[PDB]
Amino acid sequence: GMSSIGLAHNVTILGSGETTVVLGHGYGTDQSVWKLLVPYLVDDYKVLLYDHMGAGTTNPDYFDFDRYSSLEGYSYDLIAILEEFQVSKCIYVGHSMSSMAAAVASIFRPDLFHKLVMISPTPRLINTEEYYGGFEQKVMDETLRSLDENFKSLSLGTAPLLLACDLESAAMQEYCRTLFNMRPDIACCITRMICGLDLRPYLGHVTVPCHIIQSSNDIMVPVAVGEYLRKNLGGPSVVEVMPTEGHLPHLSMPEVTIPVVLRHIRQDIT
């Protein structure tokens, strides 16, 4: 039985200030992915980092396969973490999956979020006749069907294009280190859940300001998805398309991405 929210999510606190920046790591990583951003924040902000349940650094006995088969399970966990640490009006910075979990959380508890800074978000991968997310339903169905027996070979096969980095690069090695740190059944559950998401009906209920940061070339996120988010979110928004490639530009191209993230943390939409 989980006795401590803070220990179960490996919560880390640094820095000081009137406002707290909360960092969410996204699929396949853990809070270590933020290591180069944090030093630029601590003089001005309190910083809270956490690992989402099912990351390889978390206890698999706490992974509830029912709750984490939908994104809102993560949203409700995030609310509990913020409440446990008495955080409100935070600046939430998240990579893709985490940023969308925070967007959903912000509908239920808008008081906990001053703004969202979202790296590579998408509300839905699967195409419809009117919405282009980049992925055909039937190809997704068959790829997920054999995911269990192919998890490593598929993940290794796509990761260089996903990250826009060479197989032997430091970014590839680091991403694979944390990705394969998940227990395989947990990894497959999270993968199936995020591939199946449709958050389009939630967007109009999101009212907190959203800063959307995108790579110019991201195989998971067409540039049109950033514009879709801008038009369909219920509050203020801004979209920045960076001269980067890859779905995790904060990991693979920090020299461009870190200054961009810092600007959106520091500057509110006017």
Shortest CA distance to 74 belongs to which of 108, 48, 97, 47? 97
Which of 112, 125, 208, 248 lies at the binding interface for ligand HFJ (CB under 6 A)?
Answer: 125
| Choice among 9, 52, 95, 247 that is catalytic | 247
Binding-site entries: 232
**Residue 153 tokens, joined:** 């070979």
| Choice among 75, 96, 98, 215 that is catalytic | 96
Q: Does 232 bind Mg ion (CB under 5 A)?
A: yes
Q: Rule CB under 6 A: which of 201-230 touch ligand HFJ? A: 220
Please choose which of Mg ion, ligand HFJ, none residue 215 contacts, taking the beta carbon within 5 to 8 angstroms, the exact cut-off set by kind.
Answer: none
Q: How far is the CB of 233 from ligand HFJ (least distance, A)?
A: 15
Please choose which of Mg ion, ligand HFJ, none residue 232 contacts, taking the beta carbon within 5 to 8 angstroms, the exact cut-off set by kind.
Answer: Mg ion
| Choice among 52, 218, 250, 264 that is catalytic | 218
Residue pair 175/28 in contact (Cβ under 8 Å)? The answer is: yes
Interface with Mg ion (CB under 5 A), residue total 1
Residue reference for tokens 């030093």: 39
**Residue 30 tokens, joined:** 């853990």
Task: Choose one: 23-31, 46-54, 140-148, 226-234; the region binding Mg ion (CB under 5 A).
Answer: 226-234
Task: Choose one: 101-109, 154-162, 184-192, 225-233; the region binding Mg ion (CB under 5 A).
Answer: 225-233
Annotated active-site residue 247? The verdict is yes
d(CA 190, CA 151): 12
Compare residues 17 and 157 and give the one whose CB is closer to ligand HFJ. Answer: 157
- Residue 30 CB burial class (10 angstroms; 0-12, 13-18, ≥19): buried
**Residue 172 tokens, joined:** 């590839």
Q: Rule CB under 6 A: which of 167-196 touch ligand HFJ? A: 191, 194-195
Contacts of 23 (CB under 8 A, 6+ apart): 31, 34, 37, 38, 47, 48, 49, 50, 93, 94
Which of 70, 137, 146, 158 lies at the binding interface for ligand HFJ (CB under 6 A)?
Answer: 158
Helices (H) and strands (E) in the chain, counts: 10, 7
Q: Does 68 bind ligand HFJ (CB under 6 A)?
A: no
Please choose which of Mg ion, ligand HFJ, none residue 27 contacts, taking the beta carbon within 5 to 8 angstroms, the exact cut-off set by kind.
Answer: ligand HFJ
**What order do you get walking across the sheet with 20-24 strand by strand?**
12-15, 46-50, 20-24, 90-95, 113-119, 210-217, 237-245
Binding site for ligand HFJ (CB under 6 A): 27, 96-97, 100, 122, 124-125, 135, 139-140, 143, 154-155, 158, 191, 194-195, 197, 220
Catalytic site positions: 96, 218, 247
